[PDB]
Amino acid sequence: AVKYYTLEEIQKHNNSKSTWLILHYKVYDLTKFLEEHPGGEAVLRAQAGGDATANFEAVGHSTDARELSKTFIIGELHPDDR
Numbered sequence: 001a002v003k004y005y006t007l008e009e010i011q012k013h014n015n016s017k018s019t020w021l022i023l024h025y026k027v028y029d030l031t032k033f034l035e036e037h038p039g040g041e042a043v044l045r046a047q048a049g050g051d052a053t054a055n056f057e058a059v060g061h062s063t064d065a066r067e068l069s070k071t072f073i074i075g076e077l078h079p080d081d082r
């Protein structure tokens with residue numbers, strides 16, 4: 001299978017580096033994208049844990065981003081979260 005991650009497991013990644021989150025039932029590791037991500041390592045690290053779909057969408061982001069995200073996809077939201 002793909003190995004989905006629970007909101008909890010994703011929630012464990014919210015300290016300094018470990019920065020995961022859920023964007024439309026999809027998990028994106030951006031731990032090695034903090035300093036890289038133009039928004040500035042802050043909003044990403046803060047919204048880390050999950051429930052950033054609205055935040056991500058609120059920014060809008062472009063096609064390039066939408067595609068990049070897929071390259072950063074680590075899996076999907078656990079089938080026991082939804």
Ligand code: HEM
Pocket residue numbers: 021023028030037038039043044047048052055056059061062064065066068069072
């Ligand atoms: C799925 C992974 C993500 C990728 C690949 C990504 C990529 C990008 C890129 C390329 C930009 C440039 C803006 C543009 O012209 O489109 C950007 C800006 C931005 N992103 Fe992301 N992003 C991701 C996730 C997030 C998340 C989860 C948040 C919310 C916590 C976020 C918040 C922002 C903000 C605040 C900006 C700057 C807008 C501003 O305040 O001026 N991004 N992102």
